[PDB]
Scaffold this active site. Structure first.
Site, short mmCIF file in Angstrom:
data_model
loop_
_atom_site.label_atom_id
_atom_site.label_comp_id
_atom_site.label_asym_id
_atom_site.label_seq_id
_atom_site.Cartn_x
_atom_site.Cartn_y
_atom_site.Cartn_z
N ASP A 106 -12.44 -10.19 7.38
CA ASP A 106 -11.17 -10.00 8.08
C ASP A 106 -11.09 -8.67 8.86
O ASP A 106 -10.09 -7.98 8.78
CB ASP A 106 -9.99 -10.10 7.10
CG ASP A 106 -8.66 -10.39 7.80
OD1 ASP A 106 -8.67 -10.76 9.00
OD2 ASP A 106 -7.60 -10.20 7.16
N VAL A 148 0.85 -1.20 0.00
CA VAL A 148 0.00 0.00 0.00
C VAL A 148 0.87 1.25 0.00
O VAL A 148 1.78 1.35 0.82
CB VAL A 148 -1.00 0.02 1.20
CG1 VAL A 148 -1.90 1.27 1.13
CG2 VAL A 148 -1.83 -1.25 1.20
N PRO A 178 -8.49 -3.93 13.91
CA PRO A 178 -8.29 -2.49 14.15
C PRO A 178 -7.46 -1.85 13.04
O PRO A 178 -7.78 -0.77 12.63
CB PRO A 178 -7.55 -2.46 15.49
CG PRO A 178 -8.16 -3.68 16.23
CD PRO A 178 -8.30 -4.74 15.14
O1 LIG Z 1 -3.65 2.83 4.78
C1 LIG Z 1 -4.26 3.92 4.69
N1 LIG Z 1 -3.92 5.02 5.40
C2 LIG Z 1 -2.88 5.01 6.42
C3 LIG Z 1 -3.47 4.74 7.81
C4 LIG Z 1 -2.36 4.72 8.86
N2 LIG Z 1 -1.59 5.99 8.85
C5 LIG Z 1 -1.00 6.28 7.51
C6 LIG Z 1 -2.09 6.33 6.44
C7 LIG Z 1 -5.40 4.05 3.78
N3 LIG Z 1 -5.99 5.24 3.45
N4 LIG Z 1 -7.01 4.90 2.62
C8 LIG Z 1 -7.06 3.56 2.42
C9 LIG Z 1 -6.05 2.99 3.16
N5 LIG Z 1 -5.67 1.66 3.33
C10 LIG Z 1 -6.40 0.60 2.95
O2 LIG Z 1 -7.44 0.70 2.30
C11 LIG Z 1 -5.83 -0.74 3.30
C12 LIG Z 1 -5.34 -1.57 2.32
CL1 LIG Z 1 -5.43 -1.07 0.67
C13 LIG Z 1 -4.77 -2.80 2.63
C14 LIG Z 1 -4.69 -3.21 3.95
C15 LIG Z 1 -5.17 -2.38 4.95
C16 LIG Z 1 -5.73 -1.15 4.61
CL2 LIG Z 1 -6.35 -0.15 5.87
#
Ligand SMILES: O=C(NC1CCNCC1)c1n[nH]cc1NC(=O)c1c(Cl)cccc1Cl
EC number: 2.7.11.22
Length: 285
Positions: free
Chosen positions: A118, A18, A121
């Site tokens: 799944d 990511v 937190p």
């Molecule tokens: O990860 C993200 N932001 C971070 C949160 C922690 N602080 C820094 C920024 C985020 N922002 N929008 C979407 C996401 N993440 C996801 O959708 C995600 C994916 Cl794609 C795979 C596994 C877990 C997650 Cl949550």
């Protein structure tokens, strides 16, 4: 994909990396998930699964052996906010607001026949607005570098652990129940480090299940008559100092029998939510 400028790697999972990135053409900052390579059609359904408590899937970019998912970016996840709040704890009215919103998001998913599968937190993202959103809804080459996360099985429903292939929306209720407990107590409810450790931690707290409380249990794939028989412990010992409305709700999210477990929609009607509000967290970005 040339339309995106990487800002930083946010993290990696089992089958994707990511990034925080910037859309050179929209000006948008986004989270971009890269998966190394049915899946495409189920992702296209994900694009229509739009709700205020589900992270917005902005675009899907298939190029000839990578799949990129482009999400709305959120600054913080619940796992880190829980860590940040450990010394004082999340104020109850915020706990209750985040629980209510995730129940709304699940009520929505579920009515469309979508399971998350799944919840944890680190999959729950939060903003300055007091919103909380479901992310990483539950193929591809494995990231060799993915480092093992202690929290992995902690939110797994018992029917999954017991080998039920065709499990239901109730597994997401179980997970969310576990999250609820953890916000309240500032300790994971069932912190197992393998599938049998996870099962036995559940059995130790809630009692070893049997046909009385869960009809059909003894016939599940991985069920063994040789499981140790633990007595269930009192819920007042499990989540102090949660009030009786809260404990009553939690108890119903943690029912062994998937068919007795409360649905997201019935949970929203529960008396615990009579005084729900929307506070705003203090976040340090
Ligand atoms: O990860 C993200 N932001 C971070 C949160 C922690 N602080 C820094 C920024 C985020 N922002 N929008 C979407 C996401 N993440 C996801 O959708 C995600 C994916 Cl794609 C795979 C596994 C877990 C997650 Cl949550």
């Amino acid at each position: 994909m040339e339309n995106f400028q990487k800002v930083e790697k946010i993290g990696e999972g089992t089958y994707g990396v990511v990034y925080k990135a910037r859309n050179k053409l929209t000006g948008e900052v986004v989270a971009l998930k890269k998966i190394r390579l049915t899946a495409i059609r189920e992702i296209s359904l994900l694009k229509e699964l739009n709700h205020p408590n589900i992270v917005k899937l902005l675009d899907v970019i298939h190029t000839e052996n990578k799949l990129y998912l482009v999400f709305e970016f959120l600054h913080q996840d619940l796992k880190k906010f829980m860590d940040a709040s450990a010394l004082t704890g999340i104020p109850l009215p915020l706990i209750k607001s985040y629980l209510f919103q995730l129940l709304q998001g699940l009520a929505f998913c579920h009515s469309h026949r979508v399971l998350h599968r799944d919840l944890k937190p680190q999959n729950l993202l939060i903003n300055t607005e007091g919103a909380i959103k479901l992310a990483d809804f539950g193929f591809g080459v494995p990231v060799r570098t993915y480092t093992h996360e202690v929290v992995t099985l902690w939110y797994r429903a018992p029917e999954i652990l017991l080998g039920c292939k065709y499990y239901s929306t109730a597994v997401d209720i179980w997970s969310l129940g576990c999250i609820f407990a953890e916000m309240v107590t500032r300790r994971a409810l069932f912190p197992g480090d393998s599938e049998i450790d996870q099962l036995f931690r559940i059995f130790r707290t809630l009692g070893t299940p049997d046909e009385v409380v869960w009809p059909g249990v003894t016939s599940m794939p991985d069920y063994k008559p040789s499981f140790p028989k633990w007595a269930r412990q009192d819920f007042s010992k499990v989540v102090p100092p949660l009030d009786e409305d809260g404990r009553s709700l939690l108890s119903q999210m943690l029912h062994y029998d998937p068919n007795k477990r409360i649905s997201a929609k019935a949970a929203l009607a529960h008396p615990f939510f009579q005084d729900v509000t929307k506070p705003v967290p203090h976040l340090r970005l």
